[PDB]
Design a protein around this ligand. Structure first.
Ligand SMILES: O=C(Nc1ccccc1)c1ccccc1[SeH]
Ligand SMILES: [Cl-]
Ligand code: NA
Ligand SMILES: [Zn+2]
Length: 314
């Protein structure tokens, strides 16, 4: 009977000593097992494996609590989905484009590229230690762990078309936005005025207009009485705002926004590109970079810097 001593983990922080029989697969001993992002479930232990660290699924209460503390998820499938994705994202390339970490196109990953580029231009902290640690490495240019985590957190597999707005919405749940506040007014010349306060994620995301300025001036929306009402921003407290709308032709003006997402295509097949406002407008398309003084195209999300805004509408 031939054995080696190894370490298992769910987080690569807390290691647990184990002895494995070299005649049985890791599968038969630990369940699904991963070594440096590779599935070794069906592999037998090799001499060169001795002393190494393997990821396993949280199959007991110690591993479940360690996974909950590192990833801030209780979902039992999470670590499986993360390791599956990491096998592919380890093989992506992460070039520096215009001073930001991007992703070279692969596996329909344009939505992840524009999300990563966006996160580098807005003030945001992730609460799960896994996610903040991976985020800092991604900013430095080693984004494989961070992209695999985004996929695992969003219940998306490598190769599946994604939606930037949906992705941001899931990541923002894991971010420190609790103190973000939005107050808005809806005014009907008949029904009167109705105020609404939002907190957290709901305070920094809007679906229906790309224009922050328009939101501040008032946008027309229907009233239940048949009149058109005006909805406007009363007060905003957040480090940014994300304004989203179904894709349509839209002009982006240098110096009026931080960055934006463009989407070409449909629900079967499509492509995101990132537009950022620096000294001029840059289009970051995975590894590709183009500049222009103007830009017009099918924008679906725009991001704006903020701290504290109050209306002067009486
Ligand atoms: O969109 C682009 N230019 C552009 C410039 C003015 C109006 C509309 C469009 C572009 C050119 C080359 C590569 C990528 C892009 Se997004
Ligand atoms: Cl605006
Ligand atoms: Na950030
Ligand atoms: Zn009304």
């Amino acid at each position: 009977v031939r054995t080696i001593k190894v370490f298992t983990t769910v987080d690569n922080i807390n290691l647990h000593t184990q002895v494995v029989d070299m005649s049985m697969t890791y599968g038969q001993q630990f369940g699904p097992t991963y070594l440096d992002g590779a599935d070794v479930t069906k592999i037998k232990p090799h001499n060169s494996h001795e002393g190494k660290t393997f990821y396993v699924l949280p199959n007991d209460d110690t591993l479940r609590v360690e996974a909950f503390e590192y990833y801030h998820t209780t979902d039992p499938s999470f670590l499986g989905r993360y390791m599956s994705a990491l096998n592919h994202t380890k093989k992506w390339k992460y070039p520096q484009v215009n001073g930001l970490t991007s992703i070279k196109w692969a596996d329909n990953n344009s939505y992840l590229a524009t999300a990563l580029l966006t996160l580098q231009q807005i003030e945001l902290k992730f609460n799960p230690p896994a996610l903040q640690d991976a985020y800092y490495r991604a900013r430095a240019g080693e984004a494989a762990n961070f992209c695999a985590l985004i996929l695992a957190y969003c219940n998306k597999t490598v190769g599946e078309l994604g939606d930037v707005r949906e992705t941001m919405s899931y990541l923002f749940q894991h971010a420190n936005l609790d103190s973000c506040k939005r107050v808005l007014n809806v005014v009907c010349k008949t029904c009167g005025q109705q105020q609404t306060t939002l907190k957290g994620v709901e305070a920094v995301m809007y679906m229906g207009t790309l224009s922050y300025e328009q939101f501040k001036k008032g946008v027309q929306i229907p009233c239940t009485c048949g009149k058109q009402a005006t909805k406007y921003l009363v007060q905003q407290e957040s480090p940014f705002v994300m304004m989203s709308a179904p894709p349509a032709q839209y002009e982006l003006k240098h110096g009026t926004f931080t960055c934006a997402s463009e989407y070409t295509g449909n629900y079967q097949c499509g492509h995101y590109k990132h537009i950022t406002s620096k000294e001029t407008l840059y289009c970051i398309d995975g590894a590709l970079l183009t500049k222009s003084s103007e830009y017009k195209g099918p924008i679906t999300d725009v991001f704006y810097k903020e701290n504290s805004y109050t209306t002067t509408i009486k």
